[PDB]
Amino acid sequence: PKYRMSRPTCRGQKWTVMSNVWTSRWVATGTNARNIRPPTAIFLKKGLRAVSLAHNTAGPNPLSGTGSDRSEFRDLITWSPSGYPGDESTETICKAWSFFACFDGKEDLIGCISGPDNNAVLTIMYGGKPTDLYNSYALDILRTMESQCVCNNGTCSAMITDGPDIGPSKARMLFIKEGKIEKVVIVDGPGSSMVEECSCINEDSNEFGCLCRDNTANSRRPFLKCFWDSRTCKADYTCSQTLLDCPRPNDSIQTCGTSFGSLAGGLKGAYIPLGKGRICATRTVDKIQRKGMELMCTNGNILLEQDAMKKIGDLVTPTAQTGYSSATTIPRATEECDTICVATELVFSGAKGTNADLVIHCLLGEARETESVVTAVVDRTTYSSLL
Amino acid sequence: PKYRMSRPTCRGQKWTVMSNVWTSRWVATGTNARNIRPPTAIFLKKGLRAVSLAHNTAGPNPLSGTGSDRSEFRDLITWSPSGYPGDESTETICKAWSFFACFDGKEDLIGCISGPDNNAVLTIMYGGKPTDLYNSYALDILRTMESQCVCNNGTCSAMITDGPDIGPSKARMLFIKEGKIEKVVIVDGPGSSMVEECSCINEDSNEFGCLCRDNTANSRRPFLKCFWDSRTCKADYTCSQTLLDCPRPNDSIQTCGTSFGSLAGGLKGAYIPLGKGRICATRTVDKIQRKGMELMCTNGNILLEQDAMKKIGDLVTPTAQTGYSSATTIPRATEECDTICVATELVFSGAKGTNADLVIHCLLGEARETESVVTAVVDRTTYSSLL
Amino acid sequence: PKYRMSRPTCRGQKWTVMSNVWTSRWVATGTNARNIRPPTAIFLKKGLRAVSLAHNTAGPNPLSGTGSDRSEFRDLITWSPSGYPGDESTETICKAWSFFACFDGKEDLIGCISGPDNNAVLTIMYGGKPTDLYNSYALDILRTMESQCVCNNGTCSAMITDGPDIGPSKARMLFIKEGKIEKVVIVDGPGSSMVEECSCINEDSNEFGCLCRDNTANSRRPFLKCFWDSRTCKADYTCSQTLLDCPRPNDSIQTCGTSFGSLAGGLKGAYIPLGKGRICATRTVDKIQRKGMELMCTNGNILLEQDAMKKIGDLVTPTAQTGYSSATTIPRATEECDTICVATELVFSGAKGTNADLVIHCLLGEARETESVVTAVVDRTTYSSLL
Amino acid sequence: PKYRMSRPTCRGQKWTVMSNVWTSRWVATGTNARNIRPPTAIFLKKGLRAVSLAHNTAGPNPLSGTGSDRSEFRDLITWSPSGYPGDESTETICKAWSFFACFDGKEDLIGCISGPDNNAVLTIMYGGKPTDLYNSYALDILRTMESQCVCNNGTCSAMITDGPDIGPSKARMLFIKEGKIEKVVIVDGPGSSMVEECSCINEDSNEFGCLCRDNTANSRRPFLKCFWDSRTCKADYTCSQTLLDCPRPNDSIQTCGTSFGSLAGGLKGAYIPLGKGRICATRTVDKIQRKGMELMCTNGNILLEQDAMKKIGDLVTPTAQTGYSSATTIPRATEECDTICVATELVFSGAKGTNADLVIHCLLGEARETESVVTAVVDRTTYSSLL
Ligand SMILES: CCC(CC)O[C@@H]1C=C(C(=O)O)C[C@H](N)[C@H]1NC(C)=O
Ligand SMILES: CCC(CC)O[C@@H]1C=C(C(=O)O)C[C@H](N)[C@H]1NC(C)=O
Ligand SMILES: CCC(CC)O[C@@H]1C=C(C(=O)O)C[C@H](N)[C@H]1NC(C)=O
Ligand SMILES: CCC(CC)O[C@@H]1C=C(C(=O)O)C[C@H](N)[C@H]1NC(C)=O
Ligand SMILES: [Ca+2]
Ligand SMILES: [Ca+2]
Ligand SMILES: [Ca+2]
Ligand SMILES: [Ca+2]
């Protein structure tokens, strides 16, 4: 076993639907399907895995409080990308109401944040063993990405932040080898005031990048750019007139560098670098509601160009309720790039609480200048009354 | 591990029943037995496995629609040849309403077709990772074999087809190494007009063959013959007076080359080459209803000779409801041939929806000019009211 | 991995209770505990395992017919020696209403007999793959040991029989390497007329032996003695005045060689050779009812001496319902002998059918001239009303 | 694999909560959560594992008697540190109403005591096979630690004791290589009269120590000190004014060497050596009721100095009901010390019987003169009525 190196993502032809997690089907069926939020997909030591926080409950008679963000019962669990949480493939990982995880080629690296709001704590596990920690520095909900960390020759990196969820939230970048924090970088830059829930992908041998959430009125996502060799990072707002966050106003042309938006709030969304020159991102179809999930791409520098990001397609039924989304990269055994998949959360709720389905698209086929998407249908009308 | 090489099947003495999948027993017991259709057996990396599509539901209170063929909830799953779908051995593979799978000696190759009818997509996974795709070319239900692909020195081949399920459905052959499509052959030949649900088996070091379904009035099965070295294929109709499809008229002598039949429809059926000079196949005992499954064999060229195939025996209670059937081959360390087993589907239905049991016969023992069959009994009278 | 060699069993000090399978507890609890008969323990590739035929049903609402011996739904399953059938550790093996199994050091060897009474068939699996078969020669319920086969340097051996269960039942011995029957021995000798359900243990580098059931009026168990080098076997009645079968009359002194007994019927019981000079056996405490299970030993030749076998102790509560019993041998990594354990079946029945618990004693501690037993208490009075 | 060598624990910065076992959550959810008592954590071959005795039952309808200590249905089981007993991770080990376990770097050693009160037996398993026994010597509930044994170069040691739970209970130390008892030491010393439920940890390359329970009025804990090379042990009472047992009177200065206490009873408690010169221990916050669990540390000889131990923090909500506590050590590839975690039991009861949750803290981060503790909250108000 060798450490995976950072490498570009594979370009391709079409985003196909590798699998979906139909949690809601098993909730309505009546099995012990667990309440999960916010699911995504991460490539781990066992292969591709669905990963999510959970609540140490399950249907058909779940306990109260499944809509809560943080609690003593919150959980980090993984299961098969075509399974459901609570089935045979389910693995419990750690205590957590915020998490990250990734696989460096030898072992799984895991961040588990829990504890009280005024002094929460990141516990780092490597190989199933607790190996290190990180302490709250703003004393106001230390928290992390809710998606994959990123790795290269034994160094994995992971964003954390801490601070008022309306005011400033000065983020930090951790660099971790065999579960030990070797370096902590404070992220400065014109898009650093409030950065959270970064979705990070390796872009090339020496660089990775993230698209984050700004929970302030700003609708332009902060972008974190990091370099492996120097272990350094910086943040800038996206300049493309295509606003990626939710809620947001209409797309419009504004001078680069500054924040833009009138609607407080935010949503975690995927960063999908394609090859060394292309940038894609997911955004909701609805400007205010978390409905739909469309893929937008440009070949230009989205930090420097107000040029709009073209729509490649609808990952999901555009009126279906969605939620978070993030990508992960999976090795391709016979060429120098990683397959990239994006997982979008499909939130639902009812008499059995808040919960989420998952859908996983992957970019496959020979490289194309402009790709297309297979739309995943989300239609619960034949069983929603049992949810 | 070495790549498995194509080799003839082992002759034997008797078809014995290796195991039952008694899905109906567990449905009536009350456990979370999943609704499955076309189930069959395939030799995978874990060993012999029962393989089927499912609906992301289970008893005792299944969701509506288990009878449907293609929905967004359809998935591909595998379990123990002697277990039941949903039990501890169950593994969820991918999103699929049509599938193929096989094991090349190093990894499982898996083909998962889903998406809309007018533009479905085959996603190809190898060793658990999505590696490639193939797009719809007739824009009318791209689909595939619902049984094993075949392999040799890292190359595995799989039939796909596309087009109206009554009109022309010109099929194609994929040749795949490590999950990457290396060659696509349009299959031509006098029996190639409408070809689907091919059941394929390695015949010899350089040959493999398939017996397919023609869904028109024609009751002679299309037979696909392929050569590994040239990666080349051809389709011809069977000629023997023993008509293999269901529905069919009486057996009768007719000139070779042309289709023949009076009732539209079809049924996936097993091709069972036995050694180098012997051909067997399965067919329903009933000419019109999917009831019973008898085994017919000949030592002649079924594509060139009208001779009746000799009924070897009844795999199953001949008035029992059956369904699809197909074979798979299992390595034998002792000699240079593979063991061959046939799986026959046993469809049932009731209060808990549409579903199926499975029975698995294997040819074992000293080679015999003519073999016998243990008839697996199918009698549900003691518990059918709970179905 | 090397093949295990035949070696003597380890002498010791006390029979301790390594574990029990409390099927009845989980039946009363209300989980999906499976109806099993007749359980025993066998050392397999995964370690010590509880092994039994089952019925493809489970509580809390089992289907009818769990008291049947042979049926299409009968099953061979294994699970953890301290588990229960149907729990997480359960493995389904094959179709079977009669079975054997053992582990040769590289792979598991398994015999699965099923099919109709007038022509049943043994299917042999090696390593999870069907490898060979054996055919009914008396056309009257081919059947086998229901306990471990025995192995040595790749040859495992297993008793089978066939014939009227009241009249003659001329048994045969199979010798099997990598799943292939290499030799079949017809067992002659003055105790061969009716031999079934042999319980076989390796005794020394070149010899194994079995204590069998004679279902005729005879209460003296047939003993099969076999030699590895010549692959040969012979049968003689036990001569000890201590009658080991059930039902049986009082112990009494009679001339060696002949049958003795007045009560038709029989029961499978354990053969426990201790070292190279000692012979133990289990028998019911009650002479007619299958209640209790006591261990009897002698250092003399039980085929040649009417000397009584001394009672070492009560494996189980002497008034508790028991059933079958048989031993299995487990390697001891640091000396030339195998630990021996005896598993006794504890049958129970009720509103949820016929079923069985299991208890496993093993002989541990430094060698003693006369050993002792820890009595396993069997008392269901706090939950039996839920059975 | 190499045998693990005895080595000091790692100092750190903060006790963080690695995971909850929320058995109560799953009992109230309605799944088959098993009733467990004294649960703790132990590093085994699989990794960190939650370990406990159980009753061969589970919710939602458990069988009577879950409150009992020693019955024929008691068994030893292990599961995920973040799962629940009975879930997918559950493993059944042996029959036991008292136990120990550890992993020597190659295999799990496991000690299982069961049998009648006046003659119980310790069965010793190594790597899954029964290897040895130890017999009752006081004929009054032979019993053991209910926590990890300790290992070094293939030798693992375990405390056992025997005798009235109020009168003298002279303990013994077993030294075991590959499951065979190599040495038994009668532990003498001024604190050796009544010694039970010792919680033992490797202290340095040649030393390990235990903090035990004295079930008389005495509230100073017996401390066992053992040397690996001589395989030699001794028992002395703790002297610090900080009384560790429960029930206890107020802390007060008293002369070293003698017992001291006013209330009969006792409670298993954790010994937590930290590096070479530091000692911590757990005790209830409440002096009489098993409520809360605070961590106390000193850098002095607790056996020779009256100095109070400094309260480091509350592991748990201090009015929450707790129970047993004990530590385990986890290898660290990065340096020459082991990580140390403490598991505190959280007993609950109700309609579904007696049961327990588990919380697991681990010392992580840069070494600190004095460490802090994340307080794991225990609040069941939202679901307790279902317990
Ligand atoms: C990091 C974003 C912010 C932290 C307070 O709120 C998030 C928004 C969420 C949301 O908008 O849906 C759900 C997240 N579970 C929550 N994170 C935490 C740690 O509570
Ligand atoms: C749509 C054509 C197709 C033949 C390949 O019909 C099949 C017939 C079936 C049948 O005759 O029972 C059931 C199959 N699930 C179905 N396959 C798909 C993909 O829907
Ligand atoms: C080999 C013994 C004889 C065979 C007819 O009866 C056995 C007696 C049994 C018994 O006495 O309890 C149960 C066994 N399941 C049965 N075996 C078969 C194959 O049916
Ligand atoms: C019988 C003495 C013994 C102390 C080692 O009492 C323990 C006290 C217990 C307790 O105080 O809660 C519960 C333990 N399960 C019990 N152990 C056994 C073996 O019964
Ligand atoms: Ca915003
Ligand atoms: Ca047809
Ligand atoms: Ca008899
Ligand atoms: Ca005390």
Short mmCIF file of N, CA and C in Angstrom, two decimals, chain B residues 61-107:
data_model
loop_
_atom_site.label_atom_id
_atom_site.label_comp_id
_atom_site.label_asym_id
_atom_site.label_seq_id
_atom_site.Cartn_x
_atom_site.Cartn_y
_atom_site.Cartn_z
N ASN B 61 -44.58 -5.68 4.91
CA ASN B 61 -45.42 -4.59 4.41
C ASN B 61 -44.71 -3.88 3.26
N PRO B 62 -44.61 -4.53 2.11
CA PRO B 62 -43.89 -3.93 0.99
C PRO B 62 -44.63 -2.74 0.41
N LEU B 63 -43.85 -1.83 -0.18
CA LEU B 63 -44.43 -0.69 -0.86
C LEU B 63 -45.03 -1.13 -2.19
N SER B 64 -46.02 -0.38 -2.66
CA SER B 64 -46.68 -0.69 -3.93
C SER B 64 -45.67 -0.69 -5.08
N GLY B 65 -45.99 -1.46 -6.11
CA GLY B 65 -45.24 -1.41 -7.35
C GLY B 65 -44.16 -2.45 -7.52
N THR B 66 -44.12 -3.49 -6.68
CA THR B 66 -43.10 -4.52 -6.82
C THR B 66 -43.21 -5.25 -8.16
N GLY B 67 -44.37 -5.16 -8.83
CA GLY B 67 -44.51 -5.79 -10.13
C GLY B 67 -43.87 -5.03 -11.28
N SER B 68 -43.59 -3.74 -11.09
CA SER B 68 -43.04 -2.93 -12.17
C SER B 68 -41.64 -3.42 -12.57
N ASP B 69 -41.23 -3.04 -13.78
CA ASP B 69 -39.94 -3.44 -14.33
C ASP B 69 -38.85 -2.40 -14.14
N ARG B 70 -39.15 -1.13 -14.43
CA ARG B 70 -38.15 -0.07 -14.43
C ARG B 70 -38.69 1.11 -13.63
N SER B 71 -38.14 1.34 -12.45
CA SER B 71 -38.46 2.52 -11.66
C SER B 71 -37.16 3.07 -11.10
N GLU B 72 -37.23 4.28 -10.55
CA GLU B 72 -36.06 4.89 -9.94
C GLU B 72 -35.60 4.17 -8.68
N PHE B 73 -36.42 3.27 -8.13
CA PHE B 73 -36.09 2.54 -6.91
C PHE B 73 -35.44 1.19 -7.19
N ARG B 74 -35.33 0.80 -8.46
CA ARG B 74 -34.74 -0.49 -8.79
C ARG B 74 -33.24 -0.48 -8.51
N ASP B 75 -32.75 -1.55 -7.88
CA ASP B 75 -31.33 -1.66 -7.57
C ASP B 75 -30.86 -3.10 -7.80
N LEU B 76 -29.55 -3.27 -7.86
CA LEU B 76 -28.97 -4.59 -8.06
C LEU B 76 -28.39 -5.06 -6.73
N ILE B 77 -28.72 -6.30 -6.33
CA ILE B 77 -28.27 -6.87 -5.07
C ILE B 77 -27.85 -8.32 -5.26
N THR B 78 -27.05 -8.80 -4.31
CA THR B 78 -26.50 -10.15 -4.30
C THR B 78 -26.57 -10.70 -2.88
N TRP B 79 -26.75 -12.02 -2.76
CA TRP B 79 -26.81 -12.67 -1.46
C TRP B 79 -26.36 -14.12 -1.58
N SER B 80 -26.45 -14.84 -0.46
CA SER B 80 -26.03 -16.22 -0.40
C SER B 80 -26.91 -17.10 -1.31
N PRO B 81 -26.31 -18.03 -2.06
CA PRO B 81 -27.13 -18.97 -2.86
C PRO B 81 -28.11 -19.79 -2.03
N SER B 82 -27.90 -19.90 -0.71
CA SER B 82 -28.82 -20.63 0.16
C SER B 82 -29.49 -19.71 1.17
N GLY B 83 -29.38 -18.40 1.00
CA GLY B 83 -30.03 -17.46 1.89
C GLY B 83 -31.30 -16.89 1.28
N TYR B 84 -31.65 -15.68 1.72
CA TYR B 84 -32.79 -14.99 1.13
C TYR B 84 -32.42 -13.53 0.96
N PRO B 85 -32.97 -12.86 -0.05
CA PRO B 85 -32.62 -11.46 -0.31
C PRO B 85 -33.12 -10.58 0.83
N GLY B 86 -32.19 -9.84 1.44
CA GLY B 86 -32.46 -9.06 2.63
C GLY B 86 -31.82 -9.63 3.88
N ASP B 87 -31.32 -10.87 3.84
CA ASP B 87 -30.76 -11.50 5.03
C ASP B 87 -29.35 -10.96 5.27
N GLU B 88 -28.60 -11.62 6.16
CA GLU B 88 -27.30 -11.10 6.57
C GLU B 88 -26.30 -11.06 5.43
N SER B 89 -26.45 -11.95 4.44
CA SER B 89 -25.50 -12.03 3.35
C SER B 89 -25.73 -10.98 2.27
N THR B 90 -26.73 -10.13 2.43
CA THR B 90 -27.15 -9.27 1.34
C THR B 90 -26.15 -8.14 1.12
N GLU B 91 -25.85 -7.88 -0.15
CA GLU B 91 -24.97 -6.81 -0.58
C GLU B 91 -25.69 -5.99 -1.63
N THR B 92 -25.69 -4.67 -1.47
CA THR B 92 -26.26 -3.77 -2.47
C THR B 92 -25.16 -3.27 -3.40
N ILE B 93 -25.39 -3.38 -4.72
CA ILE B 93 -24.33 -3.12 -5.70
C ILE B 93 -24.43 -1.74 -6.35
N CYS B 94 -25.56 -1.43 -6.99
CA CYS B 94 -25.69 -0.20 -7.77
C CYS B 94 -27.17 0.04 -8.07
N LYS B 95 -27.46 1.22 -8.62
CA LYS B 95 -28.77 1.53 -9.18
C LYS B 95 -28.90 0.88 -10.55
N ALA B 96 -29.96 0.10 -10.74
CA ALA B 96 -30.09 -0.65 -11.98
C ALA B 96 -31.52 -1.15 -12.12
N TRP B 97 -32.06 -1.06 -13.33
CA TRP B 97 -33.19 -1.90 -13.72
C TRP B 97 -32.82 -2.84 -14.87
N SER B 98 -31.54 -2.91 -15.23
CA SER B 98 -31.04 -4.02 -16.04
C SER B 98 -29.57 -4.21 -15.69
N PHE B 99 -29.07 -5.44 -15.77
CA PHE B 99 -27.75 -5.66 -15.19
C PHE B 99 -27.01 -6.81 -15.86
N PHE B 100 -25.69 -6.79 -15.68
CA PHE B 100 -24.88 -7.99 -15.87
C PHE B 100 -23.77 -8.00 -14.82
N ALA B 101 -23.11 -9.15 -14.67
CA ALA B 101 -22.00 -9.21 -13.72
C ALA B 101 -21.18 -10.46 -13.97
N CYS B 102 -19.90 -10.39 -13.61
CA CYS B 102 -19.02 -11.56 -13.67
C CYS B 102 -17.74 -11.22 -12.92
N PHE B 103 -16.86 -12.21 -12.80
CA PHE B 103 -15.62 -12.10 -12.04
C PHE B 103 -14.50 -12.60 -12.92
N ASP B 104 -13.51 -11.76 -13.20
CA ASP B 104 -12.46 -12.12 -14.14
C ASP B 104 -11.29 -12.86 -13.49
N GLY B 105 -11.39 -13.24 -12.22
CA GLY B 105 -10.27 -13.82 -11.51
C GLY B 105 -9.53 -12.86 -10.60
N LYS B 106 -9.70 -11.57 -10.82
CA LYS B 106 -9.14 -10.55 -9.95
C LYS B 106 -10.20 -9.67 -9.32
N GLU B 107 -11.23 -9.30 -10.08
CA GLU B 107 -12.23 -8.36 -9.60
C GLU B 107 -13.57 -8.68 -10.25
#
